[PDB]
Each structure stands twice: as structure tokens, then as C-alpha cells.
Amino acid sequence: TTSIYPPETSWEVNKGMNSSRLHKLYSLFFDKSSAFYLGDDVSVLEDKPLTGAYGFQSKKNDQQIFLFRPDSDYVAGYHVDAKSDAGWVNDKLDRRLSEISEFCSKATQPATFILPFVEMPTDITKGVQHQVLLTISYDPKSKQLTPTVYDSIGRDTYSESLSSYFKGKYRTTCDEILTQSIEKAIKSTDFTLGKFTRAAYNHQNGNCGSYTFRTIKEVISSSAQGTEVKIPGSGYITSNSYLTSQHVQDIESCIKYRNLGVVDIESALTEGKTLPVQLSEFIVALEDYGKLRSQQSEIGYSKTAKLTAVELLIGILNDIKGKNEISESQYDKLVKEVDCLMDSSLGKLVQFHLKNLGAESLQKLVLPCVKFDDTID
Amino acid sequence: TTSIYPPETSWEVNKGMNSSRLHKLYSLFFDKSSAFYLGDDVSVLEDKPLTGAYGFQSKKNDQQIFLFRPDSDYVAGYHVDAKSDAGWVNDKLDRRLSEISEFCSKATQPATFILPFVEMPTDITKGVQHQVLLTISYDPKSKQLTPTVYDSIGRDTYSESLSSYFKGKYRTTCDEILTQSIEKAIKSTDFTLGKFTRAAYNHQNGNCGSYTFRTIKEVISSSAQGTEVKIPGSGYITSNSYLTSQHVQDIESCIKYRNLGVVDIESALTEGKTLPVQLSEFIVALEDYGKLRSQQSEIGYSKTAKLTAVELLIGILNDIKGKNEISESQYDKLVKEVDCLMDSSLGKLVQFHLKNLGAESLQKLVLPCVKFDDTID
Ligand SMILES: [Ba+2]
Ligand SMILES: [Ba+2]
Ligand SMILES: [Ba+2]
Ligand SMILES: [Ba+2]
């Protein structure tokens, strides 16, 4: 168990997802600068905790929404070979299903449970893991609950499609073992099991993670009321309108440039709070850029140039955090390095932080806190 | 512990290396069709086993060569931040170093120990692991032994180079902790420690694995006698001449198309044997192609077309293995699918296997074993 979610500079959406990153992204849900912001609901009065998840009262409804914090251990393996057994669900995931069942056994209000999880083939050697989303909606008056999976990799086109017969020899997904796990989680045969369905969308053939996150937003908002809206018809025209570029830079800037504790997040979705960006984060980001840039592995600006720049910027940033102040000479030295710190990736980092610090530039940011006298060097 | 090394179709060199694959590649060392073939030496008379490694008497020398079977656990982590401590070496790797030291404490003949291992930064979040190679050469009359590391990622160019000063703030490699582990492995202060050196070659910035394998070959052959020959001067002109395309298709075809037990390998380097390709392998390869092709994830031929083809080919291949025979009708059905089974990747697979089965084509391969009568459908 590790408790911080560092800035991963040089991370991009095509570089794939994991439980920690996804959880970090959760912080966006209450940030109004963000297109993932839910002003569609509020938190659940401090009761009914349902461990592992964050609760939400609908502002527009009597409907309650429980979104699970992601887990390295929510995983479903499936056997692609169909002579083999359908698969396994990880005993924690199974556990959470049993727990939903038990939350619903006593529930006076309609609920929706949103669990993100990883779906993988275990026969083959690739072991592509794709980020994927389960939601279970329960109605008390209807005495029943309906499973659904939202799958981003839902490409396949007729040429690459599978015949009814060959489907018999080959599993492309974990639906068999998963439905099994669910009808196992409820049996007093207490509940009617609504039909299991799977929502696929356009042509992915590892961006799955980010679509999953977007879908969580869509799934929550759409539950204040309204049908579920995803790409391939019954929704958005294109994948690009659905997950917009403003959704993307939001996600990327979050992962790429921020340093967030898990406590900070937990508080943030418990109290319906936004997490503003501390200056300490700017410093950590710079440091990580710094470490990564110095690497050799997987009047233009050089490595030692970039590094001296980061060193100096870091220094100044600290002396600002230090009570204290900046000195004239230091301001000059920064000015010489400004055009370098605004260059490329490092620039994007810096612009992110200046934007969220309420400063137009490095000079503007740094200009107060400077002590002057007379003529200085 | 898993004991087979399946064919990974769709694997390519740019897709990176691991302990099992690398070990599988070891099988090429005695195959004369292969450019990795050592007709430069023979095995060690069955004595002096030095557990974990394979021994070799030099045909041209009194020199002994011990190449280690790779391990998921031979790993060196290093801290890129230099205010931090240099790193860690995995207690197994350390263990093997202590064991070399002890083999050399009693040794009457000059030896060279070749250990492949993975080198990684632990501060940063990427955790790029790059396949890398240690060799330790001991002389009894010189009372001493010399460490060397061969590093393929040895790119960096002056712009992306690191100043003497910034080297002080940043580690790009595991040399510090590694040299430490070595001078720790010998202290009675019994041995003189030859100077630790590191051989880098051209411009990689994850092919590292395959270069490492090539280097093992170079390191072994070059030890029958001769200086060590790698790319950046003191060797081959270009990386492409060093690791030739004939080296590459050898490696790829090995990983991609073969099914090899670890027992088969162990025997093969113990007895100096070649492993010819069983027909069973062809069948396994086809099956794996089959599984992977049916997947949706990370008059032209369709998925269901390709699959029916594989199904039929597999069927026929089995009936061949089954004592038994093929039937006329079956031969026809194959003929209809021939142009499909020769297409693209599947084709490359099939051509690999036909080449190593002593058959010009599918029809030629399958043509005996067919029973005829009169006019058949
Ligand atoms: Ba289970
Ligand atoms: Ba039923
Ligand atoms: Ba150790
Ligand atoms: Ba010394």
C-alpha cells in the first residue's frame, strides 16, 4: 500500500491506465474547471458508508449512487479457449458483489453501484488487460437488480467479427464468469436478476482507461435521470464528441502535472470539495521532470540546459515556500532561463501550474516576494 | 515456476524481452542453421556444475565459460536521485556473485562468467526495465577478476549528455550499487578487483533484450580468444552489422513460432545438442495463432475465414500425428484453404514450420499420408 499519487510527466492517455491513476482522476469530479464535474448531485449524509465506495445523494432525485474506489484486485480473467472453463473473478471483486447484494437486501431507496475493473485473457501470453466498467442498478419496488458492462474496445467490424459457430470455440470476454459471479452473489433467490447486458463502443482494437473514466461520469450524471448515452448509437455521434479533447487534456493534466495524497482525494469526495493546487505540487512536478529528463532510456535546448533551468526554478520556488523571499540576482537568473522553462513539455508543465497559481507568467508569479535595493547586479 | 515456453506469435523484437524468452533463445546456440551457433567450443565434462549456469570448455583454449540461465530475480534497482542511496541488488543476484567468488577461490583454469540481468530506476514512476549483461573474467595466475557490463541503450549524444556536475545530482545507471555488490562478494580481500568497466553501444533511447542476446554470443565466441567486439568503435561499424537481420529473424522465428520445454533446453545445452522442430510444435503454434486471431483487442481474408483455415489445418496435422492418415476429401478441403494459410503472418508461421519439416508446401507436406480410391469427391 502506497499513499501518494505522484505527477507522471510524459504520461499520455495512449500509455494506458491503472487503479492508482484512475483513482487520482476521481479528484476531477468536483472541480468546476473540469468537464467531469458533477453539479448533478451531492454526497450521502454521513451514514450508510458501504465500505470501498463513495456515496452520493442525487440533487435531482431520490436516487443514491455508490462509486467504488478502484482496486489493483478488481480483476476478471477469462479463458479464450472455450473447452476450458469460463474463468475466474478475483475473490475481492466477488466479495464486493456479495456486499452490494447485502446493501440491497435492506435498501429503501433506488441505487446504482459503479465498479471499475480490469478484464483479461489468461490462455494467451499477451495478457492484454483492458480497463472496463461494471454498473449494477437496484430497484426496491421492482425487487430486482440489473448488471451492465461498459466496454470501450467494442470495435470489431464484420470482417473481424466472429461467427455464431466460432463464438462456440472462442471467448472474447469475461461475461460468462462475471454473470456467474453475480447470480452467485445473490442467491436466497431473493432477487430477480435483470438481464445482463454489455455496452461496447467505437473501434479501439490502450486508451480504454480514459474512456472508462469518462463513462463513470456519464453513468453518474445519466442516473440523476435519463437513458444511458454512449457512442455506437443510443448516444454520442462519435467517440471524439463523447470523450472530448477538453476531457482529455483534463485527464492528462491531472495525471501528468499533479501530486495528490489519497487522503486528499478521500476527503475531497467525502465532503464534495475541490482540491486546489498547492505550490508544493509545482515543486514536486519540476523535480520529477528533472529526474526523468536526465535519462538516457525509454538554438535548441540541451539536457544540461534543461536541467540547470529546472534546478534554478525549483530553488526559487522553495525560497518562496520558505516564508522568506526572492533576491534581485535570483530574479535575473530566472529571467535568463524563462525562455527555456517555457519550451515544449516543460513549458506545458509550467503553464499548467502558472494557470492554477493565478499567475500570467514566471516573472509575474515571482515578481512580488523579490527584495530590491538601489542598483543590484 | 512454469515449465513451457510457448510460441508467442505476433511477438516482435521491439516488443521487449524477459527471462523466459531469453532462456528460450538460448536454444539457438547449438543450431547450425543459426547465426548464434557456437562451433567455437564444447560442454564441460560432467563435473564442476556451478549451479544456475551452463558450462563450456573452449575448443580453441584452456578457457572455461559459464553462462547463467536467466532469472526473473536477477535485477538491480538504482536511485536516479543521488541524494538517495545508490540502490539495491536482488539477494539472488548477490548470491550468484558470492558463488562465482567461491568457484574462483578454487579454480585451476581461467574462467568467464556471463550473467544477463535487468537494470531499473526505482525513483521514477516509469520503471523502464532494460535487459543488460554482466560478465566477470577470472585469472588464477593473475590472482584477479574483472567485471564488465554491456549496455545496449548507450546512446546519449552531447546535447542529451550529462555534465560532470549534474552527474553528481543524477544516476543514469546501477554501476554504483553493482560494483559495491561485487567488492562485497569478494572480501577476504582475497582477490584483486580488476577495474569495473561499462560497454555502451549505439543510440537506443525495447530492443535492448535482443542486443543483450547477441552480445552473449559475441562474449562467448570472443573468449575462445580475441578482444571484445561491440559497436561504438572497438568493433562492428554499425548496430545493423552487429545484430544482423539474419540474427533478428532467427530470434523472432524462435520466440514467435516454437514451443519448447525447459527440459528440452537444459538437455540441449548440457549435451551440446540441437533441438529439431517436432510437428507437435506446428500444431501448438497454429492453435495459439488461432486463439489470438479471434480477438478483439490489442478478396481479402476475414477473421472467420482465417479461423476456419486454422481449424482445418490443425485437424489434418493431428490426424497425421495420430498414426493413421489423411483422406482425399480432407486434402481437397486443405487445397481450397492453401492460399489463405499462406497469407501474411499466418503464412510466415506456416513457412517457418514447412521449412523446418522438410516440406516445400502444405500440399507437399500433406500429400503422402493421403489414402485414395477411384474417383473421390
Ligand atoms: Ba473467485
Ligand atoms: Ba436466469
Ligand atoms: Ba541485497
Ligand atoms: Ba578499489
Residue numbers in the entry:
A (entry chain A), B (entry chain A): 47 to 251, 256 to 348, 355 to 433
Give passages from the manuscript:
Next, we solved the structures of two RavZ fragments, 1–487 and 20–502. Crystal structures of the fragments are essentially identical, solved in space group I422. RavZ structures of both fragments are resolved from residues 47 to 433 and 48 to 432, respectively, whereas the missing regions at the N- and C-termini (residues 1–47 and 433–502) might be flexible and disordered. RavZ shows two major domains, the N-terminal catalytic domain (residues 49–320, catalytic triad: C258, H176, D197) and the C-terminal domain (329-423). In line with the crystal structure, RavZ1–331 showed similar LC3-binding affinity and catalytic efficiency to the wild-type RavZ, suggesting the catalytic domain is sufficient for deconjugation of LC3-PE. The C-terminal domain has been recently shown to be involved in association with phosphatidylinositol 3-phsphate (PI3P) and be essential for membrane binding. Structural alignment indicated that part of the N-terminal catalytic domain of RavZ (α2–α4, β6–β9) shows a similar fold to that of the core-lipid-binding domain of Sec14, consisting of 5 β-strands and 4 α-helices (α7–α10). Similarly in RavZ, helices α2 (corresponding to α7 of Sec14) and α4 (corresponding to α8 of Sec14) along β sheets form a large hydrophobic interface. However, the hydrophobic pocket is closed in RavZ, suggesting that a conformational change may be required to accommodate the fatty acid chains. It should be noted that the LBS of RavZ is closed without showing a binding pocket for lipid, whereas a clear hydrophobic binding cavity that can accommodate fatty acid chains is observed in free Sec14 structures.
L. pneumophila inhibits autophagy by injecting an effector protein called RavZ into the cytoplasm. RavZ functions as a cysteine protease and irreversibly deconjugates mammalian Atg8s from PE to inhibit autophagosome formation. Unlike Atg4 that cleaves the amide bond between terminal glycine and PE, RavZ cleaves the amide bond before glycine. As a consequence, the RavZ-cleaved Atg8 proteins cannot be relipidated, leading to inhibition of autophagy.
